[PDB]
Amino acid sequence: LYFQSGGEAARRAGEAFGEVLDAGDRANPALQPIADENRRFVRDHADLVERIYALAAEAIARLGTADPAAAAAVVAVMLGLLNVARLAAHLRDQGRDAEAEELLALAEEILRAALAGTPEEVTTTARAVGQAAWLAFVAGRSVELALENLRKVKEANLEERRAFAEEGEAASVRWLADTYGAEAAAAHLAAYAAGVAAAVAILQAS
Ligand code: NA
Ligand code: NA
Ligand code: NA
Ligand code: NA
Ligand code: NA
């Protein structure tokens, strides 16, 4: 990672995201279990965290951090691969290491290919990759569904990728409200947006 210029800046940005989301979730008894699980993930899967920062460093190298759209795209890449990594971590914790790699490799292929375009295109693809994994995680942690979803993103044009990201994001809001209640869900989503903004600003200053 150290010969991947940008890895330390990506880490600072991701840690800023994590700190802000942690504080938002930790402030509310309904959301604290999320903050605790997120700390456990980072503690237990340092190798996946570093792999996320490595892909972010590739995004920094290609897009720069000289403007808000590029910075947002790098953050979106990290958050999209993080969603993939949560399912990969489940697979690894359960001894299904090869399937975890297949999942990570396909997500990384799609994200890397998007880096040839504009930041706004990268952000759309990254959001779609994130939902491809998240939707499969909630539906029984199915690597088969995740791979199918990722292949559908791969074969989708930009508008179709955006539409899929929007459907998944809407389903995600619904899941948060169903699980934590609408009131706590709104607080969580606001903290998430603040964490994105924190990470964007760290990248811009890097
Ligand atoms: Na790099
Ligand atoms: Na505690
Ligand atoms: Na964990
Ligand atoms: Na996300
Ligand atoms: Na994303």
Author numbering: 7 to 212
The authors write:
Here we present rotamer inverted fragment finder–diffusion (Riff-Diff), a hybrid machine learning and atomistic modelling strategy for scaffolding catalytic arrays in de novo proteins. We highlight the general applicability of Riff-Diff by designing enzymes for two mechanistically distinct chemical transformations, the retro-aldol reaction and the Morita–Baylis–Hillman reaction. We show that in both cases, it is possible to generate catalysts that exhibit activities rivalling those optimized by in vitro evolution, along with exquisite stereoselectivity. High-resolution structures of six of the designs revealed near-atomic active site design precision.
Experimental structure determination resulted in a 1.13 Å resolution crystal structure for MBH2, one of the designs displaying the lowest conversion. The structure agrees with the design model, showing an overall backbone Cα RMSD of 0.53 Å. The catalytic sidechains superimpose well with the catalytic geometry except for Trp140, which adopts a flipped conformation (sidechain RMSD 0.54 Å excluding Trp140). This flip widens the entrance channel and abolishes the designed π–π-stacking interactions with the substrate 4. In addition, Arg92 adopted two conformations: one resembling the design model, the other pointing away from the active site. Together, these observations provide a possible reason for the low conversion rates of MBH2.
